[PDB]
Motif scaffolding. Structure first.
Motif, PDB file in Angstrom:
ATOM      1  N   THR B 174     -28.709  22.578 -16.102  1.00 15.37           N
ATOM      2  CA  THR B 174     -27.230  22.413 -15.861  1.00 15.37           C
ATOM      3  C   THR B 174     -26.996  21.237 -16.233  1.00 15.37           C
ATOM      4  O   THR B 174     -26.624  20.174 -16.032  1.00 15.37           O
ATOM      5  CB  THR B 174     -28.123  22.596 -13.886  1.00 15.37           C
ATOM      6  OG1 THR B 174     -28.344  21.740 -13.597  1.00 15.37           O
ATOM      7  CG2 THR B 174     -27.748  23.041 -13.524  1.00 15.37           C
ATOM      8  N   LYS B 175     -27.478  20.747 -17.741  1.00 19.22           N
ATOM      9  CA  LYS B 175     -27.653  20.062 -18.693  1.00 19.22           C
ATOM     10  C   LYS B 175     -26.569  19.189 -18.523  1.00 19.22           C
ATOM     11  O   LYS B 175     -25.468  19.936 -20.179  1.00 19.22           O
ATOM     12  CB  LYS B 175     -28.646  20.004 -19.867  1.00 19.22           C
ATOM     13  CG  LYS B 175     -28.990  19.141 -21.019  1.00 19.22           C
ATOM     14  CD  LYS B 175     -30.312  18.779 -20.789  1.00 19.22           C
ATOM     15  CE  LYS B 175     -31.524  19.161 -21.378  1.00 19.22           C
ATOM     16  NZ  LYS B 175     -31.755  19.891 -21.402  1.00 19.22           N
ATOM     17  N   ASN B 176     -26.180  17.769 -18.291  1.00 15.70           N
ATOM     18  CA  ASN B 176     -24.498  17.151 -18.883  1.00 15.70           C
ATOM     19  C   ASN B 176     -24.937  16.672 -20.259  1.00 15.70           C
ATOM     20  O   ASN B 176     -24.203  15.844 -19.971  1.00 15.70           O
ATOM     21  CB  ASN B 176     -24.140  16.730 -17.299  1.00 15.70           C
ATOM     22  CG  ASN B 176     -24.594  16.549 -16.172  1.00 15.70           C
ATOM     23  OD1 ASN B 176     -25.420  15.693 -15.429  1.00 15.70           O
ATOM     24  ND2 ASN B 176     -24.562  18.383 -15.941  1.00 15.70           N
ATOM     25  N   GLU B 177     -25.442  17.441 -20.930  1.00 20.11           N
ATOM     26  CA  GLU B 177     -24.978  17.089 -21.881  1.00 20.11           C
ATOM     27  C   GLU B 177     -24.492  16.436 -22.638  1.00 20.11           C
ATOM     28  O   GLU B 177     -22.971  16.644 -22.483  1.00 20.11           O
ATOM     29  CB  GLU B 177     -25.875  17.784 -23.051  1.00 20.11           C
ATOM     30  CG  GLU B 177     -25.294  18.565 -23.784  1.00 20.11           C
ATOM     31  CD  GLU B 177     -25.065  20.151 -22.851  1.00 20.11           C
ATOM     32  OE1 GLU B 177     -25.905  20.520 -22.804  1.00 20.11           O
ATOM     33  OE2 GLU B 177     -23.626  19.600 -22.048  1.00 20.11           O
ATOM     34  N   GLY B 178     -23.942  15.586 -24.268  1.00 21.72           N
ATOM     35  CA  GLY B 178     -23.363  14.586 -24.887  1.00 21.72           C
ATOM     36  C   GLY B 178     -23.011  13.489 -23.661  1.00 21.72           C
ATOM     37  O   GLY B 178     -22.188  12.929 -24.129  1.00 21.72           O
ATOM     38  N   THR B 179     -23.416  13.392 -22.972  1.00 23.94           N
ATOM     39  CA  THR B 179     -23.618  11.514 -22.185  1.00 23.94           C
ATOM     40  C   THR B 179     -24.205  10.638 -23.080  1.00 23.94           C
ATOM     41  O   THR B 179     -24.714  10.659 -23.511  1.00 23.94           O
ATOM     42  CB  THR B 179     -24.443  12.167 -20.618  1.00 23.94           C
ATOM     43  OG1 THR B 179     -25.237  13.509 -21.043  1.00 23.94           O
ATOM     44  CG2 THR B 179     -23.872  12.326 -19.297  1.00 23.94           C
ATOM     45  N   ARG B 180     -23.071   9.403 -22.406  1.00 22.51           N
ATOM     46  CA  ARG B 180     -23.692   8.103 -23.235  1.00 22.51           C
ATOM     47  C   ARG B 180     -25.613   8.134 -21.896  1.00 22.51           C
ATOM     48  O   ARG B 180     -26.318   7.575 -22.602  1.00 22.51           O
ATOM     49  CB  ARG B 180     -23.247   6.620 -22.974  1.00 22.51           C
ATOM     50  CG  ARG B 180     -22.429   6.881 -21.141  1.00 22.51           C
ATOM     51  CD  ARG B 180     -22.337   5.376 -20.819  1.00 22.51           C
ATOM     52  NE  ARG B 180     -21.587   4.941 -22.540  1.00 22.51           N
ATOM     53  CZ  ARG B 180     -22.251   3.614 -23.201  1.00 22.51           C
ATOM     54  NH1 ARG B 180     -23.509   3.380 -22.151  1.00 22.51           N
ATOM     55  NH2 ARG B 180     -22.414   2.746 -24.707  1.00 22.51           N
ATOM     56  N   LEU B 181     -25.514   9.059 -20.976  1.00 23.64           N
ATOM     57  CA  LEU B 181     -27.092   8.645 -20.636  1.00 23.64           C
ATOM     58  C   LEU B 181     -28.115   9.549 -22.026  1.00 23.64           C
ATOM     59  O   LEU B 181     -29.411   8.931 -22.202  1.00 23.64           O
ATOM     60  CB  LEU B 181     -27.128  10.084 -19.467  1.00 23.64           C
ATOM     61  CG  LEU B 181     -26.541   9.359 -18.241  1.00 23.64           C
ATOM     62  CD1 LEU B 181     -27.515  10.767 -17.093  1.00 23.64           C
ATOM     63  CD2 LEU B 181     -27.716   7.905 -17.683  1.00 23.64           C
ATOM     64  N   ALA B 182     -27.442  10.102 -22.696  1.00 23.47           N
ATOM     65  CA  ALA B 182     -28.334  10.578 -24.174  1.00 23.47           C
ATOM     66  C   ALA B 182     -28.976   9.815 -24.438  1.00 23.47           C
ATOM     67  O   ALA B 182     -30.081   9.753 -25.304  1.00 23.47           O
ATOM     68  CB  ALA B 182     -27.187  11.965 -24.731  1.00 23.47           C
ATOM     69  N   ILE B 183     -28.126   8.801 -24.823  1.00 26.76           N
ATOM     70  CA  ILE B 183     -28.296   7.375 -25.897  1.00 26.76           C
ATOM     71  C   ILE B 183     -29.236   6.931 -24.515  1.00 26.76           C
ATOM     72  O   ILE B 183     -30.647   6.398 -25.738  1.00 26.76           O
ATOM     73  CB  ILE B 183     -27.352   6.651 -26.157  1.00 26.76           C
ATOM     74  CG1 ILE B 183     -26.345   7.059 -26.415  1.00 26.76           C
ATOM     75  CG2 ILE B 183     -27.945   5.696 -27.105  1.00 26.76           C
ATOM     76  CD1 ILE B 183     -27.351   8.012 -28.331  1.00 26.76           C
ATOM     77  N   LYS B 184     -29.947   7.194 -23.493  1.00 25.54           N
ATOM     78  CA  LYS B 184     -30.481   6.040 -22.777  1.00 25.54           C
ATOM     79  C   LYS B 184     -31.554   6.516 -22.658  1.00 25.54           C
ATOM     80  O   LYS B 184     -32.710   5.823 -22.427  1.00 25.54           O
ATOM     81  CB  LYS B 184     -29.479   6.448 -21.505  1.00 25.54           C
ATOM     82  CG  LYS B 184     -28.859   4.877 -21.373  1.00 25.54           C
ATOM     83  CD  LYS B 184     -29.161   3.893 -20.516  1.00 25.54           C
ATOM     84  CE  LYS B 184     -27.956   3.075 -21.160  1.00 25.54           C
ATOM     85  NZ  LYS B 184     -27.417   1.754 -22.463  1.00 25.54           N
ATOM     86  N   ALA B 185     -32.026   7.392 -22.657  1.00 28.79           N
ATOM     87  CA  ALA B 185     -33.369   9.083 -23.069  1.00 28.79           C
ATOM     88  C   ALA B 185     -33.835   8.168 -24.595  1.00 28.79           C
ATOM     89  O   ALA B 185     -34.807   8.105 -24.567  1.00 28.79           O
ATOM     90  CB  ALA B 185     -33.107   9.786 -22.656  1.00 28.79           C
ATOM     91  N   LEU B 186     -33.106   8.619 -26.051  1.00 29.25           N
ATOM     92  CA  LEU B 186     -33.368   7.620 -27.106  1.00 29.25           C
ATOM     93  C   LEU B 186     -34.621   6.777 -27.001  1.00 29.25           C
ATOM     94  O   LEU B 186     -35.227   6.140 -26.572  1.00 29.25           O
ATOM     95  CB  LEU B 186     -32.021   7.776 -28.035  1.00 29.25           C
ATOM     96  CG  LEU B 186     -31.427   9.307 -28.818  1.00 29.25           C
ATOM     97  CD1 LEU B 186     -30.462   9.120 -29.290  1.00 29.25           C
ATOM     98  CD2 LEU B 186     -33.150   9.307 -29.779  1.00 29.25           C
ATOM     99  N   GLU B 187     -33.409   6.131 -26.117  1.00 26.85           N
ATOM    100  CA  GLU B 187     -34.389   4.243 -25.632  1.00 26.85           C
ATOM    101  C   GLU B 187     -34.692   4.122 -25.206  1.00 26.85           C
ATOM    102  O   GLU B 187     -35.788   3.414 -25.311  1.00 26.85           O
ATOM    103  CB  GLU B 187     -32.583   3.921 -25.324  1.00 26.85           C
ATOM    104  CG  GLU B 187     -31.664   2.907 -26.328  1.00 26.85           C
ATOM    105  CD  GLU B 187     -30.739   2.244 -25.041  1.00 26.85           C
ATOM    106  OE1 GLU B 187     -29.453   2.488 -23.970  1.00 26.85           O
ATOM    107  OE2 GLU B 187     -29.918   1.156 -25.570  1.00 26.85           O
TER     108      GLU B 187
END
Lengths: 48, 254
Positions: B174-187
């Protein structure tokens, strides 16, 4: 639409590079620490 | 120099002027031998020749870096051999190094430096048998012992983190990808967090973006737990990174 294609196009590329940098940083840590651990642990074991 | 006398060399190559290598050796008086017999001390070569390949194929000699002897000439005193000073060793020196070195090439009886440690490290094999979880605690313990634990790229080391990039909690696409959450997991990954894709008991933190659609269900699911995760805004990790230091959670709660 043009302007903010350009903004997304760029944002997605910096994403890509940042993913490369994050992966290279994780690998740099675990690799260095695994080698340190080997060298270090042989000193500890011999010390013991 | 009355030192290199009674010590017998072999300048098998060198072209740094090769015929001047032994000349410099000559005002130091180092005993010059064209072809190394079982008597000689070591062999010196500015490159590889096929005879070098021979004496490699017969370990009965000790094979040396060009720079080492120059350093001993710039110490005005013989510098007894060290791991970097060699490029191959004899079996007597190998059995001596089975007393005197760690097996990977870090010598017990000499203190090493940046270029030597890089070399030893690059010579260790590639492997990943340690579980990521074992490894994270080895690292977390070493940074605790030596106080590296406040170091910025490791500030979230002691955080296990679920991230709300899933339209259904715990359902891995149910991955909501392209989210700025993706940058926060890189961080979070870049600064030492154990970013996780299941909200099991092992989680200390859940991170929430714009979409509060699931916070009731995190808060409800957290009623199950023995040790209870925090739910934090995205801005916690940002602010902690920007200040190079953990800013702490309670202003960032829910």
């Amino acid at each position: 639409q043009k302007e903010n294609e350009r903004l997304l196009r760029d944002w997605n590329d910096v994403q890509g590079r940042f993913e490369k940098c994050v992966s290279a940083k994780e690998a740099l840590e675990t690799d260095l620490y695994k080698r340190f651990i080997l060298v270090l642990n042989e000193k500890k074991t011999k010390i013991r | 120099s009355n030192i290199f006398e009674d010590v017998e060399f072999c300048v098998m190559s060198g072209t740094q002027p090769k015929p001047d290598l032994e000349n410099r050796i000559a005002e130091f008086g180092g005993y010059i031998v064209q072809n190394p017999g079982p008597d000689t001390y070591c062999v010196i070569a500015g490159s590889e020749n096929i005879r070098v390949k021979n004496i490699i194929l017969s370990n009965k000699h000790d094979v040396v870096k060009p720079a080492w002897l120059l350093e001993c000439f710039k110490t005005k005193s013989f510098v007894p051999w060290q791991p970097r000073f060699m490029i191959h060793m004899c079996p007597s020196t190998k059995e001596h190094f089975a007393r005197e070195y760690d097996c990977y090439g870090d010598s017990y009886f000499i203190d090493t430096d940046l270029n030597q440690l890089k070399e030893v490290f690059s010579g260790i094999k590639n492997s990943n048998e340690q579980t990521p979880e074992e490894m994270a605690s080895l690292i977390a313990d070493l940074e605790y012992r030596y106080s590296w634990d406040c170091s910025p790229l490791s500030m979230f080391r002691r955080h296990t983190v679920y991230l709300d990039s899933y339209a259904v909690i715990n359902d891995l696409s149910t991955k909501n990808e392209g989210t700025r959450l993706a940058i926060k997991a890189l961080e979070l990954r870049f600064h030492g967090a154990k970013v996780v894709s299941c909200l099991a008991e092992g989680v200390s933190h859940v991170i929430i973006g714009e979409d509060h659609s699931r916070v009731a269900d995190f808060k409800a699911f957290r009623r199950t737990f023995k040790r209870k995760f925090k739910i934090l805004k995205e801005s916690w990790v940002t602010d902690s990174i920007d200040k190079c230091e953990l800013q702490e959670e309670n202003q960032y709660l829910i």
